[PDB]
Ligand binder design. Structure first.
Ligand SMILES: [Zn+2]
Length: 181
């Protein structure tokens, strides 16, 4: 199924992967197929007094490289050699071609700041996102399977059916897909 595509360090985005993008009010772009589900999610959060924003949706190859390089630089400044910094940065930011952001199926969701804090939004997403087809992609108890640190902002659309099962069983996407055989 299209919404269950696996992208990670071992599963690059296919060459010639087509995505039709829609622009949100803030200029971030998403796969048009997830648009109503993301809108429903945001509508529900706001009905609960929780006010999120899409900090980052779709990214081009060059954008992903720039974000990765900026993370490498942050490590270099904290006392890592370039090689150490690259390896450490990858636990947060994927090498170009291996980010879900390049699918259009992932959004980094933050708080608006003024009505909600980060932790309020992250908590609401953790407890509710699956009802709209999104999963907390990189949970803190699955870093040894996903290869990614706790990123409570990063939500991936898989569809309501899969998201609900993933949530109830406490899985990451890799486990879910493996268990489907
Ligand atoms: Zn992200």
């Amino acid at each position: 199924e299209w919404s269950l595509i696996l992208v990670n360090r071992q599963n690059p985005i296919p060459a010639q992967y087509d995505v039709e993008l829609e622009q949100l009010s803030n200029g971030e772009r998403i796969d048009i197929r997830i648009s109503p589900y993301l809108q429903d999610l945001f509508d529900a959060a706001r009905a609960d007094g929780v006010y999120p924003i899409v900090a980052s949706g779709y990214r081009t190859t060059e954008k992903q490289q720039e974000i990765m390089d900026e993370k490498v630089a942050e490590y270099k400044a904290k006392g890592y050699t370039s090689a150490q910094a690259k390896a450490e940065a990858e636990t947060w930011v994927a090498v170009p071609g291996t980010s879900e952001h390049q699918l259009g199926l992932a959004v980094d969701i933050n708080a608006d700041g003024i009505h909600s804090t980060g932790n309020e939004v992250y908590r609401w997403l953790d407890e509710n996102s699956y009802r709209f087809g999104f999963i907390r992609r990189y949970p803190p108890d699955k870093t040894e399977i996903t290869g990614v640190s706790n990123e409570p902002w990063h939500y991936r659309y898989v569809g309501i059916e899969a998201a609900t099962k993933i949530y109830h069983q406490g899985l990451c996407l890799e486990e879910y897909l493996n268990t489907e055989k």
